[PDB]
Each structure stands twice: as C-alpha cells, then as structure tokens.
C-alpha cells in the first residue's frame, strides 16, 4: 500500500571553471632589397649580299 | 635578294635565398580511464559545401 514520492531530491554540484590565455608576437622587417634579374649585353648583325 | 638579318638577347640572373623555420607544439590533457576527450586549439574557417 505504500506509494513513492513524486521525485527524489538529488544533490546539487557547483562547477566552477578557469580559461586563461596569452598570446605574444614580434615582426621584424630591415634591410635592402635590389634587383636580381636585369637585362644583358645584345648584338645584332645584318646584311644584304645581293 | 639574298641576306641575313639575325641577332641574341640575353639575361643575367644572381638570385640568392634561405629559409628556416622551427615549430613545436605541447598539448596536454585529462581523461577518465574508459572516457574520450577531445581539445582543439585554433580555429574554424567558412566553406561553402552543399548537396
């Protein structure tokens, strides 16, 4: 004849949570910078026999 | 009519260059004996992918 009860008290949890985060950067950039590919010497000849 | 008419061209070329570069990475993580964990640290990018 006995009944349950309409629910069971459950025990209750705290959570307690940490993210920590760094970040760090250098850029550097320094000097000269010349060509690498320039044009060259050019000869041509030509001529007419007849 | 008989003749030439020829001639070159050229280039000159004096590239030179290095490269380094060095990484490591140290990931860490936790996980119960039977469990599954999963971490990711970095990023999501958008692509356009349908049926």
Redesign the interface.
Same mark, same amino acid.
């Given at each position: 004849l006995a009944t349950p009860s309409p629910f069971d008290m459950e025990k209750m949890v705290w959570l307690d949570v940490n993210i920590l985060e760094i970040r760090k950067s250098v850029l550097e950039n320094f000097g000269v910078d010349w060509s690498?590919?320039?044009?060259?010497?050019?000869?041509?000849?030509?001529?007419?026999?007849? | $009519? +008989?003749?030439?008419?020829?001639?070159?061209?050229?280039?000159? $070329? +004096?590239?030179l260059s290095n490269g380094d570069a060095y990484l490591i990475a140290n990931p860490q993580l936790s996980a119960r004996s039977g469990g599954r964990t999963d971490f990711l640290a970095g990023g999501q990018v958008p692509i356009l992918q349908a049926l």
């Open positions: 690498k590919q320039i044009p060259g010497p050019f000869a041509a000849f030509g001529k007419d026999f007849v | $009519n +008989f003749g030439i008419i020829t001639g070159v061209l050229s280039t000159i $070329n +004096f590239a």
